[PDB]
RNA sequence: AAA
């Protein structure tokens, strides 16, 4: 048993408890190409050993291989062929890959070249190597590979800034991963911007790094320094390296901002480079969907004619794109809430259902997002389905997911007013009283909440 | 990646 426990004391991809879905493995090999041919960074080790790993999961073991050793070409065609101890995590999958295929004498060899290295510098484990890189080598792992990991990946690039703190590359790691832990929480009450200062500091250390700049851009903008933020966007526009991520986000940062047909160029170039992107996707969505907002304003809610056929238009237009999001990532909670959102536009009542029921079943990794499904289904019963019953059940079990956010207040403030509105046709309806009671008591009200569950219990 |  010696071999499968050394294995177990490699730092690899095999070891990192990464957890891939299969619901969500044609996505992530999609990003990871993606990231192959358009994302700009030193090195290319880490996404070429996840790219094997990906191979590895699906059957493809030769697949897998070839990966590898791609990665270790280019560790060496562009750096000079020096040696560099992110080598470290290949062979490490090197190593795995044969003994999972029972090629067992080569995987040994892979351990021997692991412990080599790790005796050569005086690492204090066998084959459990203990360096920064390897650190953020893991972080990267983490970060692309879905938001249950991201705790984990800020965690092993903190690590590497408590030891060294201006370290451009944790530097970089850390901040996306606190940018992307804040936008958990950006709809939760009294949230803070964790991610500000780190995102300006990754940015001092890696002064060439658009996507770092288009992140901070955007954090800037969400407290309230768009024109501040806009710099940081015109500099990473003006460089070529990572375009195509630079357009995501300056097209985010521009449709936030208002410029809405902007927005819709940039996106429509980046998907010219990354068709299965289901950001881009969901992005040119919103597009359609602020495009619609805004035509229905301009005829006051009553478009006709040529308004009328553009205001369809940006229906189909934003439903063939959730749809799009939806088919290449099952597991994209908010799009298929924005779809459902915009089936009731489309006047399909039955396809917004669904959507919503398949919604109900689902476990994000953001558990807040189930109030704003509960909300928004129960919005649809009041006002589409014309059904306070169950208008009353979702409202209800988006307030009784505790956390305080926009759509709790918003959840508690449409029961109030569905209340009201019945109490006004039959003031005595028992139910109805004890739920504004109940309304009252949650808002603090304390003597005209028990004001109305007691007036609800004499009525019993 | 909605908010
Ligand atoms: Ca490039
Ligand atoms: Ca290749």
Redesign the pocket.
């Known amino acids: 048993h010696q071999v499968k426990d050394s294995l177990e004391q490699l730092r690899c991809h095999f070891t990192w408890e990464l957890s891939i879905d299969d619901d969500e493995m044609p996505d992530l090999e999609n990003r990871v190409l993606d990231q192959i041919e358009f994302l700009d960074t030193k090195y290319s080790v880490g996404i070429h050993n996840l790219l094997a790993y990906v191979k590895h999961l699906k059957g493809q073991n030769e697949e897998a291989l070839k990966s590898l050793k791609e990665a270790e070409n280019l560790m060496q065609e562009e750096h000079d062929n020096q040696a560099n101890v992110r080598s470290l995590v290949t062979w490490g999958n090197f190593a795995w890959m044969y003994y999972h295929m029972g090629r067992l004498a080569e995987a040994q060899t892979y351990l021997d070249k692991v412990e080599n290295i790790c005796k050569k510098l005086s690492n204090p484990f066998r084959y459990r190597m203990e360096c920064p890189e390897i650190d953020c080598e893991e972080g990267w792992a983490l970060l692309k590979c879905g938001?249950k990991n991201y705790e984990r990946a800020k965690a092993c690039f903190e690590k590497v800034l408590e030891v060294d703190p201006e370290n451009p590359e944790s530097s970089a790691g850390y901040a996306i991963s606190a940018?992307?832990l804040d936008?958990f929480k950006?709809?939760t009450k009294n949230h803070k911007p964790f991610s500000l200062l780190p995102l300006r500091q990754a940015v001092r250390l890696n002064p060439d790094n658009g996507y770092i700049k288009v992140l901070l851009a955007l954090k800037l903008q969400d407290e309230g320094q768009e024109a501040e933020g806009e710099k940081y966007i015109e500099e990473a526009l003006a460089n070529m390296s990572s375009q195509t991520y630079v357009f995501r986000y300056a097209a985010?940062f521009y449709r936030?901002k208002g410029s809405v047909d902007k927005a819709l160029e940039l996106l429509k170039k980046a998907l010219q480079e990354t068709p299965t992107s289901?950001?881009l996707h969901?992005?040119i969505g919103?597009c359609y969907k602020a495009q619609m907002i805004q035509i229905k304003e301009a005829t006051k809610g009553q478009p006709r004619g040529q308004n009328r056929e553009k205001l369809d238009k940006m229906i189909r237009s934003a439903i063939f794109h959730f749809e799009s999001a939806v088919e290449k990532?099952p597991?994209?909670?908010?799009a298929h809430?924005?779809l459902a959102r915009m089936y009731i536009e489309a006047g399909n009542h039955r396809k917004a259902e669904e959507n919503f029921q398949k919604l109900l079943c689902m476990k994000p990794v953001v558990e807040?997002?189930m109030q704003?499904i509960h909300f928004h289904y129960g919005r649809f019963q009041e006002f589409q389905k014309k059904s306070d019953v169950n208008a009353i059940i979702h409202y209800l079990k988006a307030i009784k997911i505790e956390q305080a956010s926009?759509?709790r207040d918003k959840s508690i403030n449409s029961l109030k007013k569905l209340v009201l509105r019945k109490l006004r046709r039959k003031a005595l309806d028992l139910e109805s009283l004890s739920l504004l009671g109940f309304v009252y008591k949650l808002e603090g009200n304390m003597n005209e909440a028990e004001e109305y569950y007691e007036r609800a219990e004499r009525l019993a």
């Open positions: 938001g940018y992307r936008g950006l709809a985010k936030r289901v950001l969901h992005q919103l990532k597991t994209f909670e908010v809430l924005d807040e997002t704003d926009l759509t």
